[PDB]
Design an enzyme around this catalytic site. Structure first.
Site, PDB file in Angstrom:
ATOM      1  N   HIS A   1       0.805  -1.242   0.000  1.00 21.93           N
ATOM      2  CA  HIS A   1       0.000   0.000   0.000  1.00 21.93           C
ATOM      3  C   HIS A   1       0.838   1.294   0.000  1.00 21.93           C
ATOM      4  CE1 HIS A   1      -3.663  -2.067  -0.154  1.00 21.93           C
ATOM      5  NE2 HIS A   1      -3.255  -2.884   0.811  1.00 21.93           N
TER       6      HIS A   1
ATOM      7  N   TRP B   1      -7.157   1.846   5.034  1.00 21.80           N
ATOM      8  CA  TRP B   1      -7.025   0.587   4.314  1.00 21.80           C
ATOM      9  C   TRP B   1      -7.161  -0.594   5.244  1.00 21.80           C
ATOM     10  CZ3 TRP B   1      -6.881  -2.456   0.236  1.00 21.80           C
ATOM     11  CH2 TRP B   1      -6.954  -1.854  -1.039  1.00 21.80           C
TER      12      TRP B   1
ATOM     13  N   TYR C   1      -4.569  -2.851 -20.259  1.00 23.03           N
ATOM     14  CA  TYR C   1      -5.146  -2.208 -19.076  1.00 23.03           C
ATOM     15  C   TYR C   1      -4.043  -1.769 -18.122  1.00 23.03           C
ATOM     16  CZ  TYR C   1      -6.731  -1.253 -14.496  1.00 23.03           C
ATOM     17  OH  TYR C   1      -6.932  -0.490 -13.355  1.00 23.03           O
TER      18      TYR C   1
ATOM     19  N   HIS D   1      -6.760 -10.996  -5.544  1.00 22.92           N
ATOM     20  CA  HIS D   1      -6.803  -9.673  -4.930  1.00 22.92           C
ATOM     21  C   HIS D   1      -7.146  -9.726  -3.455  1.00 22.92           C
ATOM     22  CE1 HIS D   1      -7.228  -7.185  -8.850  1.00 22.92           C
ATOM     23  NE2 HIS D   1      -5.971  -7.333  -8.475  1.00 22.92           N
TER      24      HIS D   1
ATOM     25  N   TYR E   1       1.736  -9.525  -9.071  1.00 23.17           N
ATOM     26  CA  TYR E   1       1.949  -8.439 -10.027  1.00 23.17           C
ATOM     27  C   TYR E   1       3.355  -8.525 -10.621  1.00 23.17           C
ATOM     28  CZ  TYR E   1      -2.566  -6.219  -9.564  1.00 23.17           C
ATOM     29  OH  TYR E   1      -3.904  -5.925  -9.739  1.00 23.17           O
TER      30      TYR E   1
END
Ligand SMILES: O=C1N2C=C(c3ccc(O)cc3)N=C(Cc3ccccc3)C2=N[C@@]1(Cc1ccc(O)cc1)OO
Length: 197
Positions: free
Chosen positions: A23, A93, A139, A176, A191
């Site tokens: 994050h 978060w 994307y 996710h 990722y």
């Protein structure tokens, strides 16, 4: 990475430096002017005016996607016309991760799944809820969250792909949940290093 019948991890690990680093990396990425704050207006500009327009969304697809982005970042505490700094962001978060995993534990659809559905409706040209490698490169490179073809290939290698070699939204949603929310070791690498761990 775990098949299609893998049961999601439902507890959190907020003091794990990998969670923090994911994050902090995204916060610094979204802090486009490096002034230590972000707001919801910037998130929606990115979503609607850059990503949706460039990738060919209709006005209606763009509207649906925008509501999902509003809800997702709003769940982490972002608001229109108000700025959010890092300590506030990461506390927000923790709340988002917790409420998402709670939703999932109760068979209630997650904000991140709704976002995926809205995005895939735009970028999945065949319409079966799954994207090819080239669609995912387009994307992620337009969003800026991955920047090389090899990172996207690593995502596809990591995930369990469907019969046609494509990435389904249900798989990416499970990934996710384990990557953005619960720190599931089986989701590490998702990722390809573009976002850490
Ligand atoms: O998951 C995703 N993202 C997570 C974060 C993000 C941001 C901050 C954090 O602290 C953590 C995560 N930022 C962006 C990129 C983005 C940011 C803002 C506006 C539009 C897009 C992003 N794009 C997604 C979209 C997506 C969603 C569901 C799917 O099934 C597939 C793809 O795939 O990577």
């Amino acid at each position: 990475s775990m098949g299609s019948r893998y049961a999601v991890k439902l507890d959190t690990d907020f003091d794990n430096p990998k969670w923090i680093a994911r994050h902090k990396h995204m916060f610094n990425f979204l802090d486009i002017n490096s002034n230590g704050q972000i707001n919801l207006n910037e998130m929606v500009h990115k979503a609607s005016n850059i990503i949706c327009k460039k990738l060919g969304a209709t006005e209606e697809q763009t509207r649906r996607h925008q509501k999902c982005v509003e809800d997702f970042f709003g769940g982490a505490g972002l608001e229109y016309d108000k700025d959010t700094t890092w300590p506030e962001y990461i506390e927000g978060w923790k709340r988002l991760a917790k409420t998402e995993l709670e939703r999932h534990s109760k068979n209630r659809v997650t904000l991140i799944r709704l976002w995926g559905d809205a995005l895939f409706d735009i970028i999945d040209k065949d319409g079966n809820g799954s994207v090819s490698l080239d669609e995912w490169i387009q994307y992620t490179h337009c969003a800026g969250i991955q920047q090389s073809r090899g990172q996207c290939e690593a995502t596809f290698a990591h995930c369990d792909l469907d019969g046609d070699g494509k990435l389904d939204v249900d798989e990416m949603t499970r990934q996710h949940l384990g990557f953005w929310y619960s720190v599931d070791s089986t989701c590490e690498g998702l990722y390809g290093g573009a976002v850490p761990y």
